Ligand binder design. Structure first.
Ligand SMILES: [O-][O-]
Ligand SMILES: [Cu+2]
Ligand SMILES: [Cu+2]
Ligand SMILES: [Cu+2]
Ligand SMILES: [Cu+2]
Lengths: 276, 74
């Protein structure tokens, strides 16, 4: 399984990814991934149990969630893999990612409605069902609520951080995980959600297929961090209330631990990944 | 650690209310999920990656986000 930079996909690979995602939507499977993510983001709190977000397990949890979604895509078309969006490089609305043959563009200004691409409401193929309001159409406002995507130099500053995570293991932490998540510092992952706008800025953010490509690049940055810091590993390593320790299992699956997800090469490789 | 004060105002045509419960927000009488971060900032389910300083600021951000749309119960 090789995960490729979206910018490098052939026309046929874009066609097959789009079709596999649309079939997961048609069959009802896609919306349950949206629902799972929203349930966790609503329940994960800084002073209480926290698993998918704002906690050390943010990265293995999304790694496993993306594996679930990729395996679902492969059940429709076995050649499909999740691509990743390097938003430090492809940082304008002119990126091919946002062309009508791939994800479609920004939303119109009156109501944020995406008007082109395979996921535009007008196609009849992308109802927004799992939602927090009456609006049933895909929306985006690329660059509307925040002016810039992270730059490579910003990403590099975060990759240089040696500790994976630190007490109190939440949105107030120092360390790599919370700076990549974005609650502290120059802000990588959270800012990209804000930059896309529309459903991507909300607890039902998997409603936008770009969710997967965003998190596949966050997941690549975790793999890059590991190559930069072979002497660092997931923490905490046991006995932490409310937080998933290295050898504890994670909800909703219950049968996998962060320890089982640290080495991505058990599941996929990247088109290119820097050595240490 | 005491909760923010309650509030009630019309913002961009819509009634927004907040009250300690740990804190509840309503837009036109429909509850809006909000959460407090460790540093005292707030987010809502329609702006969940975007910390703002107060629950009223999160309610106003939600009204901005909604562009007139009814909130669905959570
Ligand atoms: O995490 O979206
Ligand atoms: Cu999220
Ligand atoms: Cu929440
Ligand atoms: Cu996210
Ligand atoms: Cu070395």
């Amino acid at each position: 399984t090789v995960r490729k930079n979206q910018a490098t996909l052939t026309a046929d690979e874009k066609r097959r990814f789009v079709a596999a995602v649309l079939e997961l939507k048609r069959s009802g499977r896609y919306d349950e991934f949206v629902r799972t993510h929203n349930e966790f983001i609503m329940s994960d709190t800084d002073s209480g149990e926290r698993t998918g977000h704002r906690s050390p397990s943010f990265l293995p949890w999304h790694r496993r969630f993306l594996l679930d979604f990729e395996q679902a895509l492969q059940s429709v078309d076995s050649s499909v893999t999740l691509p990743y969006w390097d938003w430090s490089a492809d940082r304008t609305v002119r990126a091919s990612l946002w062309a009508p043959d791939f994800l479609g563009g920004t939303g119109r200004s009156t109501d944020g409605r995406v008007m082109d691409g395979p996921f535009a409401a007008s196609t009849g193929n992308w109802p927004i069902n799992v939602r927090v309001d009456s609006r049933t159409y895909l929306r985006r406002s690329l660059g509307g609520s925040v002016a810039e995507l992270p730059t490579r130099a910003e990403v590099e500053s975060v990759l240089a951080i040696s500790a994976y995570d630190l007490p109190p293991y939440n949105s107030a932490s120092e360390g790599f995980r919370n700076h990549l998540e974005g609650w502290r510092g120059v802000n990588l992952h959270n800012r990209v959600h804000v930059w896309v706008g529309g459903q991507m800025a909300t607890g039902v953010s998997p409603n936008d297929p770009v969710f997967w490509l965003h998190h596949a690049y966050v997941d690549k940055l975790w793999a890059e961090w590991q190559r930069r810091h072979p002497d660092s590993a997931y923490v905490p390593t046991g006995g932490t209330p409310d937080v998933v320790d290295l050898n504890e299992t994670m909800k909703p699956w219950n049968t996998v631990r962060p320890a089982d997800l640290l080495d991505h090469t058990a599941y996929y490789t990247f088109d290119a990944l820097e050595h240490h | 650690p005491a909760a923010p004060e309650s509030f009630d105002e019309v913002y961009k045509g819509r009634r927004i209310q907040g009250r300690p419960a740990g804190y509840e927000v309503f837009v036109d009488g429909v509850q809006l999920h909000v959460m407090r971060n460790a540093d005292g900032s707030w987010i809502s389910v329609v702006s969940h990656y975007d910390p703002v300083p107060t629950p009223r600021a999160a309610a106003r951000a939600a009204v901005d986000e909604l562009q007139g749309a009814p909130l669905l119960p959570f």
